[PDB]
Structure 1
Amino acid sequence: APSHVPFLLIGGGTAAFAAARSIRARDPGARVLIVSEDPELPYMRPPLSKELWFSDDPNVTKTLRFKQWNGKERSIYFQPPSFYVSAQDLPHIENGGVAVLTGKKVVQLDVRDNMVKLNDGSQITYEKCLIATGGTPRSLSAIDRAGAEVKSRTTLFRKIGDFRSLEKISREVKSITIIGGGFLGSELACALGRKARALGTEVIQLFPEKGNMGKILPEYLSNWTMEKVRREGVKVMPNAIVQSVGVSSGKLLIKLKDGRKVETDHIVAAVGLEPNVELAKTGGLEIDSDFGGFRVNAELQARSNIWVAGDAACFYDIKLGRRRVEHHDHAVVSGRLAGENMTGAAKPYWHQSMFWSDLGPDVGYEAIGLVDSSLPTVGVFAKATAQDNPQAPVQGEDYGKGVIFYLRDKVVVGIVLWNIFNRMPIARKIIKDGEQHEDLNEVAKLFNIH
């Protein structure tokens, strides 16, 4: 660990890596240090809830290689270890390169003196710095307030480590319960459901909302989705409010506020994330009270010499207003954009990032913009043409293929492409134009629906 380094990147996930690759591309001589709390070198997370589960290789938990949707096999890691330079070496080695100081944590930040202090006492000074701290899984107070007995049987899910433990458990218990109906809970339910199909074991998913992906999708579509998650071999329990959790003769017992009791062997809790904003205290950086995370401008800049990117960044979108996005692709785009800006670029966030998700073979979608079920929607499908806050939506209908528009005024500000491939460039085009559209059935033709 050197005492000075030109570019300091705090946090060793997706955003930070994208930043490093970007800086090097715009300054082929650059010297970049990543300080990373995790012992692991930068890796992507999506395969931990999706592809690593569907691998036919039994060695998959050691190899950590997966197949992409298009044949090509690869590693979970961004680069092979042999592509980074030592932390000690980084000041000298000609041409520079990227170093990763693994297993250390930044615990104090002094913006005045361009300096960080590590948890071991080390101090580093910097010319340019990026916070890319990500966030931590939220906990359930019903679990927080229980005993060792309970907590020992409870998983949060974020790291490679978590994928090794849960994969092991799935192979040796009879029943697992997922608590949460968002992205992680739902994707996990499917992966575990396809696994339980072989052994005839059970998988329960329960949550407060009426159906999966309640905070993202309109009610009709969220309902349609839940039915598909069931068909993956999952026992879905909507409208469940967890009251308490204890053990009874070696088993977990979940008690719902409705009087029902759920018995199970293990619990995974997917109930959102808390953005990692500890450094904001000592650094004296503005936190956003509405969205959470560090408040930064359109260029991801907080103070001079310091930028924020990824899950921890609340930024200004010139086109869609202030936001904070927590998705893989956004981490890449914003990390890459901060890299450019740390090497003088000065460009505002403009190329919109996107996301995607899959729940069994029949639910596959991509999305862009402000995609929030609390906004008015207009949806258009190969069966019906439904509006929600050309008529009001009917559950039980066929919703296998369509596009859903999310509105502010007459302006489309978010789109979800529902089992439709290869039309993302047009979704981008529509968000960018920001026209007040007369008839959205016209706009929908752009996506081949009809």
Structure 2
Amino acid sequence: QDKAPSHVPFLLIGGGTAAFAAARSIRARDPGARVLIVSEDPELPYMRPPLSKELWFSDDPNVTKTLRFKQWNGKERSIYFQPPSFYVSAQDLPHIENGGVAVLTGKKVVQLDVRDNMVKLNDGSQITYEKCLIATGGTPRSLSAIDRAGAEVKSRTTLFRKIGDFRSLEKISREVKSITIIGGGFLGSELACALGRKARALGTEVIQLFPEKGNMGKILPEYLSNWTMEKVRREGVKVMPNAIVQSVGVSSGKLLIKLKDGRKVETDHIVAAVGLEPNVELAKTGGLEIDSDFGGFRVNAELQARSNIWVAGDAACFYDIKLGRRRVEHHDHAVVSGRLAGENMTGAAKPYWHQSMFWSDLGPDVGYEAIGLVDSSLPTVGVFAKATAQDNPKSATEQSGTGIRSESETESEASEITIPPDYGKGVIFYLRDKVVVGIVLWNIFNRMPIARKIIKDGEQHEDLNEVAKLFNIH
């Protein structure tokens, strides 16, 4: 019966990626530190990317119990950041010799009293802190057509975010004839591909619909958005672009989605993958400033919301050194900003100047990376080439030993860049006035430090075909 201590020097609210990175950082710099993670979920801290990717590519019926997945290179890894025995119990935390990290699982912080340096849990427990990190992440947006459809439809809609969602949806995948994914972004498309692969064996149907002309249409320019839609269609998924959902109802036991254009889609289950809402409930009681335009808790350069409260990960609205106020949903960001928060809580006093990278794999054969401002409404220049046999996530994993792309790319920008004297890979430059403000890499790995350097420098480029040569495109 894990009992909450009355006081902890370091209190981390939320037990996700950013919390874990902070906990690691605090203990590295203060080897006797006493750190408590308070986590709403019943599980110990775990990474999210495998939930839409490697966990679905497995013959092992046992993997939904163990959550020990095989990477694209065949090697097993646990979804948990560390073995459960590396944590100490919450009750031992205040006086165990040499300190430790405890996690109170199944407990939610429902009140933050910043002037009293205290939080209240859902069970009424009160805990004081010396330093606090808010790392509450986000909650999935629902579709208003689902929200207004009643309990029956809502009960047959998954918002895909946690271990529990993976297990429920994997079970649904084996039991029903038709599943529809609403949303064309990277998560929607990853699940389309995962579900489509399962459906081929089973002889069942997977549909993906969304309002854009093609997959990832808000990010990717037409050529690659269209190319991705073709790749998902090659997995056996019925992809419906230009689809605006008017309503969803139940008809003769099936869900019936009505689209504005007049088409109607019958299906057994819906997965909504339509973005995230930063979890800022605590800002009310806390009196903490939130950003109305981008969402999230506002923080300064050191990730502080208050002299002794920091924010990291998806819940933070930070000042991007290039782009201004910003919020992101990037594993890399959660790790680096968590880590930095931990350092600043142990006296580093350093600013968040990192340029956060994103990646997505649609299976072992197709991958993407992105950095900076990537928006398909911006002017773009794409340079493409035929793929070599090494230009895919599987080969990147083989080479690096990891499927967590942000781990293998490193965090740094290249020290210098010197341009040297059908398509299946390329680089997309997003432009403002000949300056590169964002880059998408399609099946190009180990070049993120070059992309970070190009954006950081912020020079004008006369010829992006020359710059593409840095990405081994020519």
TM-score where L is the length of structure 2:
0.90
Q: 1:196 to 1:92 in 2, by over 3 A?
A: same
Q: Distance between the aligned counterparts of 1:67 and 1:205, measured in 2?
A: 26
Q: Distance between the aligned counterparts of 2:221 and 2:326, measured in 1?
A: 20
Q: Distance between the aligned counterparts of 2:294 and 2:7, measured in 1?
A: 34
| Alignment check: 8 A CA contact 1:36 1:105 kept | yes
Is 1:85 paired with 2:88?
A: yes
Matched residue SS, 1:417: strand
Matched residue SS, 2:188: helix
| Alignment check: 8 A CA contact 1:376 1:388 kept | no
Q: 1:386: how far off?
A: 24
Q: 1:247 to 1:383 in 2, by over 3 A?
A: same
Moved more, 158-167 or 353-362: 353-362
Moved more, 320-329 or 382-391: 382-391
Q: Distance between the aligned counterparts of 1:223 and 1:68, measured in 2?
A: 28
What's the Cα RMSD here?
4.5
Q: 1:318: how far off?
A: 2.3
Q: Distance between the aligned counterparts of 2:430 and 2:330, measured in 1?
A: 19
Note the residue ranges of structure 1 that are not aligned, 5 or more in a row. Answer: none
| Alignment check: 8 A CA contact 1:296 1:308 kept | yes
Deviations 1:8-57 (Å, cap 9, x if unpaired)? 10001111001000111111111100011111100111111100000121
Q: 1:388: how far off?
A: 25
| Alignment check: 8 A CA contact 1:300 1:308 kept | yes
| Alignment check: 8 A CA contact 1:130 1:308 kept | yes
Q: 1:241: how far off?
A: 0.9
Q: Distance between the aligned counterparts of 2:339 and 2:17, measured in 1?
A: 10
| Alignment check: 8 A CA contact 2:146 2:154 kept | yes
Q: 1:376: how far off?
A: 2.0
Q: 1:361 to 1:121 in 2, by over 3 A?
A: closer
Q: 1:248 to 1:394 in 2, by over 3 A?
A: farther
Q: 1:294: how far off?
A: 0.7
Moved more, 283-292 or 373-382: 373-382
Matched residue SS, 2:369: strand
Moved more, 24-33 or 317-326: 317-326
Q: After TM superposition, where is structure 1 displaced by more than 6 Å over at least 4 residues in a row?
A: 383-395
1:393 aligns with: 418
Deviations 1:41-75 (Å, cap 9, x if unpaired)? 00111111100000121211111111223332111
Note the residue ranges of structure 2 that are not aligned, 5 or more in a row. Answer: 394-415
Deviations 1:191-213 (Å, cap 9, x if unpaired)? 00000011111100001111111
| Alignment check: 8 A CA contact 2:189 2:215 kept | yes
| Alignment check: 8 A CA contact 1:221 1:399 kept | no
Deviations 1:288-328 (Å, cap 9, x if unpaired)? 11111111112111110011010011101223322111111
Matched residue SS, 2:274: coil
Q: Distance between the aligned counterparts of 1:401 and 1:372, measured in 2?
A: 19
Deviations 1:228-283 (Å, cap 9, x if unpaired)? 11111100000111111111221111111111111111111111111100011111
Matched residue SS, 1:446: helix
Q: Distance between the aligned counterparts of 2:178 and 2:279, measured in 1?
A: 32
After TM superposition, list the pairs within 5 Å mapping 1:14-25 onto structure 2.
14-25=17-28
Q: Distance between the aligned counterparts of 2:390 and 2:59, measured in 1?
A: 42
| Alignment check: 8 A CA contact 2:387 2:425 kept | no
Q: 1:212 to 1:120 in 2, by over 3 A?
A: same
| Alignment check: 8 A CA contact 1:380 1:386 kept | no
Q: 1:393 to 1:61 in 2, by over 3 A?
A: farther
Moved more, 177-186 or 143-152: 143-152
Moved more, 248-257 or 144-153: 144-153
Q: Distance between the aligned counterparts of 1:261 and 1:384, measured in 2?
A: 39
Q: Distance between the aligned counterparts of 1:148 and 1:406, measured in 2?
A: 43
Aligned pair count?
449
| Alignment check: 8 A CA contact 2:137 2:278 kept | yes
Q: 1:384 to 1:45 in 2, by over 3 A?
A: closer
Q: Distance between the aligned counterparts of 1:387 and 1:358, measured in 2?
A: 15
